[PDB]
Symmetry: D2
Subunit: 250 residues, 4 copies
């Protein structure tokens, strides 16, 4: 049988590109989404038209709360219910917005969303994936610029740094079970939908390799490498895919 | 007149050593405590005997919750109330225990991520908002990249605190607030740990085959708050006797 | 037309596996070697049997000296003379032995350990870029550089320098479309003459499978980095270490 | 007796400030210099006027060559000759200039000067210091920007990375002899004499903490800390003194 992967926040953008590339490589995919129901079903429809019964959707809020563990448990369970196995987990879903230190969500909600989606949910999903258990691995979407952060993004930066810690800790602890745990760290890839072209070009111009953002496919390419048999001895590694951005001084 | 400092978890061990050394350097101090009221008070008593009305205590739980923001505001306020100013914040309080991948999990999150990361962030917010040699010092961990087996939440918390150190250094630099870290390796070992396990750790340390005293940790804190560190921000000083250099 | 690659120290072990895998991927290869002439030629003959006129050998000492720059220029030149192009440079050759702080002279130890691990890569990179679809350099780094073996300071210095080169060259060559990356093994092929009981001490420390990487596993990461799947990746170093570097003392 | 320190490249700028501050703390000082004979002798005069017989000069080229080991041995020997002990070594001397990868000194000379001064001479001095052996320690002047380097400075950057490696390897190997080895990593401090004012101001404006370069004295302060009794458990550590510069993205 074909292996199966869960990709979180897979309805659009980088998460879709990953689910699509995994699907093209022969994986069955759970397309997790939160709010983007139309886009999720649309993608699953496309993949199922390509090979029937190879894609399902799974809705869940990944904000931290007392029920986040159950929701993460259910995402993994969805993969086993659909396909009878779960070989790969990609932790892609992420909230991203400013939380200035010197200052209409409460700070408690910001913490829940930015730390929950970027770090706590990846942890609980990792726990569930491991407990529910060939080439098993987890790939965490990290951030190449965590050490040179955008001004006023403390909470998002904290969550991405915690995700590096999870990557290392989980690679260590799960290696005995043959589960590898690695990261992919974009620099600038698909810019935010809300960002104007002028601001987008300011970022593009900073990138040494080509003065352009990574395509979603270029990010997926690295994920596909880490899940592949060509990475069978790689665990605890985070591959930057940033066209040299993180090497550029102020 | 004299500058004032808040030290979280200051009743015992490393945070006590930090409080005492700050006091000895001429700071007035807020000794924050959670469960260790008796100890916090005994320390305040010792400090006030040295110099009258230069040490107060402040109780707060730093577990993440709907009230954590209010608690953190209160800790900072208690500094301004007692002393009229708040020059230094030392984020020392910390929970530490295993959370195997294979207390409810969400309590473990609230404690491990709340004490180690979220409370530092909220205290930092309150400290900056209420604003000279202003600085914040976060107690990190030199072994974050070579973590203890089954300690993922703790490690996540400590990595998040590195993130906070950097992001806050960047954002607060315009206000003249410096933000730095001190990363112990093995210092005062956990009360719970057996004596044989303790010696196993001591033996691994290149520099002298022993743990750091609490005062050795406090020494690095004192440097970072001093006028000798006025251009230093976003730096984390390991104080680990070379432990993190030692391969498997 | 087929692309071409130079692999330094390609006669044996990891560099051999890299040359083979590049050849399998459709590259013509320059097999650089220092002392291992018989192994290099054997490899070239094997490759040429697979596909005629796709492999040459090139002898050179990579120890630091006033002739090192000329040597390095000649290695790159040999690829252009054999194949008309040079698409990929793999800085694999490396000396590795203890240099305690407290029977070669120290200046020899410096020339060999810094020359092979750092200076020769720099000179090869300069010659590669000066001579210029999908150009890239891959440097063989070391996952354990921040947790070094006792009494290996010169080796460790050389490998950290190579990190610096990887970063500095990625930045500087990115406008020419040349990517520069690294692959950092932890423990891979150990000396054949090292006792199994000592090899097992290292094997036991690796989380992922309690074994060293094969040379082929290291080569797989090189192949990824030179591939079209890594078109946006520059300045990156991929650890291929089975989680060894994550293990505390 | 008073402890003694060697400071390489101590005639001017940051090395001079370290020598002065060590002297102020109680140390006897060897002022190593290469070309700056007048400024070296002038500094030694000033310190000796303050406390007689507490400063000597020592001339040496730190370019790599087959005789660099003997010159390094000579620098340490000169400390023992003057003061009968050598407690502290400060590796401060450094060449710094561009070495572009793509097109009056030969490349052989560039390597010898940039790798010799920044790395090989530190190693040889460390070896001589250790071989001749209270509170013993070495401090290497590193560079906070080594992961976000200046364009076309590959050989310099390679040398400074090697110096980080040396700091770690020697901290490990010398810990059993009670010798601690640490680094101080400036961002922008005293800017190059040859740099125009507009370019100096460009650099200043990048620094978050104050929009200005470090004083030599601020760099020296961290050196003083690391050699002091307040750093007795610190080895293998590199303290950035960069005003946040390395945190700033492109
Ligand atoms: N884009 C870039 O330039 C960079 C990206 N990255 C990382 O790469 C990954 C992909 O980036 P990108 O595609 O731009 O990500 P997006 O900003 O597009 O977010 C991906 C998905 O995350 C989901 N998500 C957000 N909040 C929640 C929540 N509370 N619960 C559940 N799901 C949620 C959303 O699903 P839905 O729409 O269904 O609600 C969204 O579609 C992320 O981890 C990101 O941090 C890192 C650096 C740069
Ligand atoms: N000891 C070591 O070897 C090492 C220490 N460190 C770091 O150094 C710092 C000091 O370490 P150490 O002195 O051993 O720490 P402790 O484990 O002794 O914790 C310090 C204090 O934190 C307070 N604390 C714990 N949980 C909470 C909570 N939920 N709310 C409020 N306060 C709480 C407690 O105060 P109370 O007693 O009042 O309840 C406790 O006394 C920590 O940040 C630690 O992670 C890092 C690496 C090694
Ligand atoms: N093996 C491992 O576990 C690890 C390897 N690495 C790195 O991976 C790479 C490959 O490793 P491995 O296969 O073990 O390497 P080897 O020890 O087999 O070295 C590769 C080749 O380097 C060449 N070389 C040595 N000295 C010189 C010199 N002075 N001039 C020219 N060439 C010279 C030799 O060529 P010849 O035989 O022709 O004389 C040798 O065959 C190296 O860069 C190494 O540091 C990193 C970490 C661990
Ligand atoms: N200034 C800054 O902004 C920064 C400095 N640093 C580091 O801090 C340290 C001090 O910086 P700075 O004061 O600017 O250094 P300088 O550029 O002023 O160099 C210090 C001294 O090094 C000596 N030196 C140079 N070449 C040789 C050689 N071949 N042999 C022997 N000595 C030599 C010179 O001695 P003489 O005059 O006697 O010939 C020179 O005065 C250096 O390691 C530097 O890389 C790091 C980052 C930023
Ligand atoms: C400004 O370009 C960026 C840099 C980092 C980012 N991280 C994310 N994460 C996300 N969840 N969208 N988007 C980014 C966009
Ligand atoms: C095993 O020695 C350690 C290693 C890391 C630690 N972190 C903490 N933190 C704490 N809050 N006690 N204690 C430690 C004790
Ligand atoms: C522990 O075994 C090792 C670790 C690192 C190494 N680096 C190298 N380099 C080399 N040129 N062989 N060999 C090694 C062997
Ligand atoms: C451009 O400002 C800098 C940044 C790094 C430097 N390193 C040095 N080193 C030196 N030997 N002068 N000078 C520098 C000047």
């Amino acid at each position: 049988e074909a292996p199966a992967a869960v990709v979180t926040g897979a309805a659009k953008r980088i998460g879709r590109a990953i689910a699509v590339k995994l699907h093209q490589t022969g994986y069955r995919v759970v397309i997790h989404y939160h709010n983007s129901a139309e886009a999720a079903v649309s993608l699953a429809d496309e993949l199922n038209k390509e090979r029937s019964n190879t894609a399902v959707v799974c809705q869940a809020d990944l904000t931290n709360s007392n029920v986040l563990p159950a929701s993460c448990e259910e995402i993994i369970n969805s993969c086993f219910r659909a396909f009878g196995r779960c070989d790969v987990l990609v932790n892609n879903a992420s909230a991203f917005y400013p939380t200035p230190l010197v200052q209409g969500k409460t700070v408690e909600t910001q913490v829940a969303e930015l730390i929950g989606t970027n770090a706590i949910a990846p942890f609980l999903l990792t726990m569930s994936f491991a407990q529910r258990q060939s080439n098993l691995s987890i790939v965490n979407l990290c951030d190449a610029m965590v050490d040179q952060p955008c001004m006023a993004f403390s909470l998002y930066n904290m969550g991405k740094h915690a995700l590096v810690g999870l990557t290392q800790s989980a690679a260590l602890e799960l290696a005995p079970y043959g589960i590898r745990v690695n990261g992919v760290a974009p620099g600038v890839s698909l810019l935010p939908v809300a960002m104007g072209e002028e601001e987008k070009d300011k970022w593009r111009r900073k990138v040494p390799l080509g003065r352009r953002e990574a395509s979603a496919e270029q990010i997926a390419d690295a994920v596909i490498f880490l899940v592949s048999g060509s990475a069978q001895y790689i665990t605890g590694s985070i591959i930057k895919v940033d066209g040299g951005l993180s090497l550029v001084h102020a």
